[PDB]
């Protein structure tokens, strides 16, 4: 039905050009009647843009192009018009007409054995290809097409990357045009060349003195399948090859004390890849101790008697406990000097000892739920875990009794030993065939080794070690945290049943001495009589049990500062890979804030939680911020990098926001106010812009333009209504002018807040303006160029231009006080700010945010854009670009479509100096000859300029003349008779229309 | 003759060890002080330094005074001593406070003798500076300064003048009183704010006498214990230093007059004669050193330069300690860059700081 919506377009816009006949001020002042239908009327001239609309479509002409008239130069405002609100419609209907066809076909990806085709079944009665990364959408550079719509990719695409393709469909001029296809099932790029991105180290970290881990994991583009890595160790060299699937290493047999760098790679078929670096250092070595200075204790567990030996050369012996039946499994305490007990049948004993002898007696202690087989103990919660057999169930108590918490599943093999590691949230326990691993919630089942019986196993919370020994095999074997490090230790020969570790040394059991070695003959031998068979040796020092963990240091400091507050938030130091969610993550904190012009610091220790805010501080003054953890024991952390921070200067500091339902609040610095006003405005809105201190203007989500007033809502609005395709709004205080962007008519309207009258100024395809009101230059973005229109036409300047697959302009602002200029271009995949003079293009920072919504903020001398979730606004200071300052939205208008800080003066009224004075009726005078009038000059001196209209017969001339003097020609013969028209105009507004009538 | 086999004798009669103490050398340095092992320190590191760039060591005679009123009898022993029994005999170095009390003596000896700068210069900025930026609230106060002799009054409001501070003594309820000696802050009854400010070391008495919630403005002793700890250059800690603690102000204030002797001795090695043997005419005219074209003002870091002593001013610090029973560490001023820092321990449990406005702002003129 072309034919029908070709003449429902045109009847629509013969009915606009009727509707729209008293509307629009013209630039002579013509003021024709409704039925005059002269050339010079509002009709005739928007009914010539109605009669060349689908002209310039079929000959690919430009609507300034099609409506060019000898009589009205250079722009004849209400034909362009006319002709690019008769095109947008059209294109409107015909994105609705093709909508579900385009919506609905999707292309398929067809290679043959060549470049790569696209295949679209697409028959029609510019197009763009976008790709997108599987892990937004980027524009192809190079396709060759055809008109079967059989795309072919001839650009280097990313290798081993898999691609999603879309077809974008601009139908008009206009970018809410687009059509978009379903995109693509998904083609993975063949294999070729080397890899080109670098591994991803998670953690990087020192174990103890002589072993060091790494955790990886693959990078975005492999550029093939990933066959093995290789990790290169150095001293401030290793190298070792890893296969394909893993995504750790712990790199044995190093010295202690020694920074080290360690380089990744990815090597596939073809070859290496990059490298990325890290620094970490082992630890620093314990100070081995001689068999003479060893003031530490032991307790060796038989079948029926514990006995507490003490590590002396001269070594004291007791008995602690004697048993009639025969101990299974037993627990130790070094804070609470608890010993618990267990039997054959389940009888849980605890005891107390101190300094090797009786405190306590023997109490038993009946569990409240299975009958207890093994048990260990938890020394940070204070719990009690039991593996009983009823099939085997890990559950765990308190120490009183009762509190039956079941930990996992149930298993068939019977659990042998059972050790808890409560400072990284473990629980260990070996079968007959396996060692395994839960955390205290029982969530993470791992298993360790499938080893053929193994023997007693000793974890080291601090260092991740597990060491574990082998009695059938004569071996001793260590292992991680997580099974994938297994490294053989030569065992001393004899089998033994138990061991234990002081430092490096090995305290192994013999049914008649305990010996010391670092052979047979040791360094260290205490001599025992009164234990046949020993299966335990539990080691007395507080690092068997520890509370405080290694290290800690805290991440991502941030702070959003006010005038005389500041609230900072940091995160917690982060948990290693060899930690489960059940461990010790107890810190205090300790924040520094260093004042830099007085050299003074003030420290705040203690602090619980990972916020902290701070008040009454000093205005515009920069702070430097560092932050430490703290832990249990109270051993301070490292310190992170130092933040420097400027406070806002004195003032109070409102922020304007608006909620998208409509709700405006008003807030501080800091988002702490929140002072909800009484106005309620539509749908989506933009950013208000003032007449005076009641009535403003603002542009909603869909173009709409509204007025409300804010203080009586009958009057102060002179549009009725909502006024559609509109995009920016800004206001003169000087000239008394508001001016917005027609999206429908490609032009800028400037319209009296008083009277309402409207005028069509020819600045082209403008999306958002600003105007300085020192000389009243326009400044206008387009979403391609960012320019100048000015009174004189020497006077446009361009700032910067986008090639648009590039992206577009997002905002701009003007900073009339220093003649700055900065604007926002939506990019792909980036957010980039600039900087120009109004009078060196420099690059702020690159990092997307809400269109028309970057602010200037003349206290802070920051700028300030709102980002597109609308829950988070960006700041970035002019001193400080590095660090963007993230202020939260509050939450009574929480998804936020505007914002806007305040000015703290009033507007200023109407300057009367700009108003030109009109051109007296009686002084328009006749001297090829020349036309005279008074000169039209305003309240200050301004540059007043003229416009004529030289209406005689039916021809009619106009002109554009700086002089007060008509340099008048072409008249066709003697006896004319002239009506002449002066209309003055200064940069700011224009007078009224003095009407003569003269005769030559 | 008998001074030099029985030594110094002073009056039972005590031995020599008991006062004196010796790092060996060529030329001997008297140091006649109250700190005699910071005076060791300097010598020490200005013998691992090798400013002189001489095979031989300087070496000291360290004399501790306890009491200022039997420093003379030892200082006719040390001119009997470095007159008679020494080879070579640079100058006695006697600390400002027993210079300023015995110069009669000393004019009247007409011997080599030198002042050691005082170390009230290196502390009272920095009690006005600890004062000046110390958390209060929005209180005036009445003040009442108490020293032991009038001179540290008049520097101490002479820096109170240098860091833009009134003390005048309004009548009001709100008390301040700040104590200049060891024991003028005695269990005090009075009823206010108390800082005191001790001149000496700080023994267990002075913190046992001291009253709840009083400010101890005191510099920090370190204790010497190896010599990997003092720089990044190896050097060799002597065995007597092993195990003893120096006071900072003591260092820098000898070290500045030691850097200046040694690079006057570097002068006089330089015209004249290194080997100590080959060399002769070490101390012909030796007064040119306190002449200005020889005397020269250092900065602390320069100081910690020049003797090797660079990751020692980490733990050169001025702090203030209140008494509550325990001294918490509350004020920190380093000496090297002289930045403040304060400690606040959140306690209540709360999740912010109001800040309280400063001592200097309140006392502002
Ligand atoms: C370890 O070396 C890195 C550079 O390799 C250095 O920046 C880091 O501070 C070193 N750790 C030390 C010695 O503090
Ligand atoms: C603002 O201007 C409008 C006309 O544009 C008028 O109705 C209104 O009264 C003015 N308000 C104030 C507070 O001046
Ligand atoms: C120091 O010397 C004086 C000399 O009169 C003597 O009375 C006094 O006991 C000595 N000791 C002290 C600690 O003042
Ligand atoms: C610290 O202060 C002293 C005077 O008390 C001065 O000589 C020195 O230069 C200052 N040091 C700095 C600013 O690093
Ligand atoms: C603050 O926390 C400490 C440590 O838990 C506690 O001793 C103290 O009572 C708490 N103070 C309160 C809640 O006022």
Redesign the pocket.
Known sequence: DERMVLERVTRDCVQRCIVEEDLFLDEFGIQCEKADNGEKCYKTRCTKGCAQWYRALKELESCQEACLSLQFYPYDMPCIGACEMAQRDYWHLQRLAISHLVERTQPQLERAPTPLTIRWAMHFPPFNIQYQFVDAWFNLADYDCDEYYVCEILEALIPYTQYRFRFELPFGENRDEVLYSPATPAYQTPPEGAPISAPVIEHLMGLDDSHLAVHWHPGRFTNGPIEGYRLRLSS?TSEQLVPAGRGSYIFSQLQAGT?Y?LALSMINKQGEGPVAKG???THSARNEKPAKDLTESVLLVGRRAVMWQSLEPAGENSMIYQSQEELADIAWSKREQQLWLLNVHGELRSLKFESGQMVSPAQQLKLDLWVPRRLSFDWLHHRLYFAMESSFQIISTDLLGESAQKVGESFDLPVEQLEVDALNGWIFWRNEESLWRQDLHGRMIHRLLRIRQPGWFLVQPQHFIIHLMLPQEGKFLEISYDGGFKHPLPLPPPHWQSFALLGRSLLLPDSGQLILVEAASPSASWPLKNLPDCWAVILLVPESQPLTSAGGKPHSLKALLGAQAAKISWKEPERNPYQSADAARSWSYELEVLDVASQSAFSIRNIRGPIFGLQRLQPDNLYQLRVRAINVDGEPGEWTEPLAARTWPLGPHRLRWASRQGSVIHTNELGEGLEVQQEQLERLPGPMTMVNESVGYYVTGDGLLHCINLVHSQWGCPISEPLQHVGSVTYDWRGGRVYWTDLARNCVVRMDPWSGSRELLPVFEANFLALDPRQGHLYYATSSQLSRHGSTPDEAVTYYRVNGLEGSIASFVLDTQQDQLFWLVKGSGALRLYRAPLTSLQMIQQIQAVPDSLQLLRPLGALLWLERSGRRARLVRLAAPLDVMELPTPDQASPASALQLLDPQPLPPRDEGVIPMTVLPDSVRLDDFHVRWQPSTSGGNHSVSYRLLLEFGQRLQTLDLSTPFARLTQLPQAQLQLKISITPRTAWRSGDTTRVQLTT | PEICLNGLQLTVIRKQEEFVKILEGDVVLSVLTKDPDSALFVINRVNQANLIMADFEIGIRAISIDNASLAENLLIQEVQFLQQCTTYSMGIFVDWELYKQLESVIKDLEYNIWPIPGTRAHLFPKVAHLLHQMPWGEKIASVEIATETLEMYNEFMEAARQEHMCLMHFKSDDNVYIMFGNKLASHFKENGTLFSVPTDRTDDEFLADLPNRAFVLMENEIDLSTAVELDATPTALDEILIGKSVLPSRVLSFAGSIIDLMNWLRGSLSKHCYVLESCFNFLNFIEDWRTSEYRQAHDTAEILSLLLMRKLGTAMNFQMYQKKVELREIASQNFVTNVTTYYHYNRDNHTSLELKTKFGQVFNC
Do not use: D, I, K
């Open positions: 401030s920074n760098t620094f970490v250092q």
